Structure formats: C-alpha cells, structure tokens
Design a protein around this ligand. Structure first.
Ligand SMILES: COc1ccc(S(=O)(=O)N(CC(C)C)C[C@@H](O)[C@H](Cc2ccccc2)NC(=O)O[C@@H]2CC[C@@H]3C[C@H]4CO[C@@H](C)[C@@]42O3)cc1
Ligand SMILES: [Cl-]
Lengths: 99, 99
C-alpha cells in the first residue's frame, strides 16, 4: 500500500496473540508496545523522547504481524501512550519514505 | 527520492538562513525544532511524547526548505533532542509511506 500522511499512519498489528493498533513511525529507532505480557527473558532499558526517559523491558526475537506482513525483531514493552512500530521492524516489511 | 529506513532518515533543512539536520518523522503530528530565534509572535503549546509533556513556542507561516523542497507552515520551538519534521510539513512536500 501507499499511505498518505493527512492522518496518523495507524495499522493493525498482531503480537503475542493479541490484536493492537500501532503507529508506523520513521522517527522511532526501535519498536515500543504498551504494557503486556510476553514470553522469554528480558533486560531493562531506558529510552528517551521529548519530555524525558522511561524504563522499558527489552524482548528479543519477537514475531509481529504488521498489516499482514510477518517480521521478527526486538520489541520494547513499557508505559507508552501509543504503540510504535519503529525502523527495526519497518525495514523488514520493506517500508520506504517517498517524495 | 525513495528513502529506506536502515539508517535514521536525516535530511538537511534550511530555516532562518541556517542549515540544520532534521529527522523525517511520520510518528510526529507537528514539526519541532531546537531553540532558535524566529520572526513574529508566538503562541504557547503543550506537546506530549514518550517521556511526558514540555512547553514549546508555536510560530506560524515559517518558510522552511526540506531537502530542497519549500514548505511554509507551523513550527514548534523548544528543547528537543533532535529536530523533527512532522506530518504537517511532510504532507506539503508530498511524502508517503510505501510497502
Ligand atoms: C529507541 O527507540 C525509540 C522509539 C521511539 C521514541 S519516541 O516515541 O520518543 N520518538 C522519537 C523521536 C522524538 C526522536 C518517536 C516519535 O515519532 C514520537 C512517537 C510518539 C507518538 C505519540 C505519542 C508518543 C510517542 N512522536 C512524538 O513524540 O509525537 C508527539 C505526539 C503529540 C504531539 C505531536 C508531536 C510533535 O512533538 C512531539 C513531542 C509530539 O507532540 C524514542 C526512542
Ligand atoms: Cl531488531
């Protein structure tokens, strides 16, 4: 698909057996998902945005379906107000910015 | 151009006579630039990201050249770690997300 940017670029994702809405975000290095339970070991991490830093749990090798496209990578879980699909997974579905 | 996302999508902008680097950010509604002096009156705005809220100054109808494309629109000025080009100006230069 080609997605215009008049509105937030939100898509449906499947992660950990649940359906969620998430933002396709070229400004995010990593993918950040609201608090949920995932399997495996995790390590703590601090990530910084506008307004300061938050603590998240880093999970590796997580499978995510993004608008029907399967991808695997690291997912950060923490108190974000919006689910964010970052560059580490956008590259895997072949996403590009065009102008 | 067509910009892949294996690296941060950084571009050169020109604003108020100065060259700066900025991130093309589909996850940002608005455009936010580090502290600088711009012409005209400003208005207050609160913006919220991952780490809380900050107060910024809103300037309207600012000329800005983004990777050689001219845009005229609203720019927010405040303590941001990186200069962010958001959807308000990405739509003016005709940017889309494709996969
Ligand atoms: C290592 O991995 C990461 C991954 C992500 C982040 S990140 O979330 O911190 N970030 C990184 C940028 C700032 C360098 C990704 C950016 O796309 C963010 C996404 C977003 C949208 C909505 C809510 C939270 C986060 N966007 C935003 O902050 O948008 C807000 C939205 C409301 C208004 C409109 C915008 C103009 O100013 C900002 C503060 C905004 O206020 C950092 C590190
Ligand atoms: Cl990854």
């Amino acid at each position: 698909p080609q997605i215009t940017l008049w509105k937030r670029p939100l898509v449906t994702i499947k992660i950990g057996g649940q359906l969620k809405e998430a933002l396709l975000d070229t400004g995010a290095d990593d993918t950040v998902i609201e608090e949920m339970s995932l399997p495996g070991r995790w390590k703590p991490k601090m990530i910084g945005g506008i307004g300061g830093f938050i603590k998240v749990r880093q999970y590796d090798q997580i499978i995510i379906e993004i608008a029907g496209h399967k991808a695997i990578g690291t997912v950060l879980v923490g108190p974000t107000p919006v689910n964010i699909i970052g560059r580490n997974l956008l590259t895997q579905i072949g996403a590009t910015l065009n102008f």
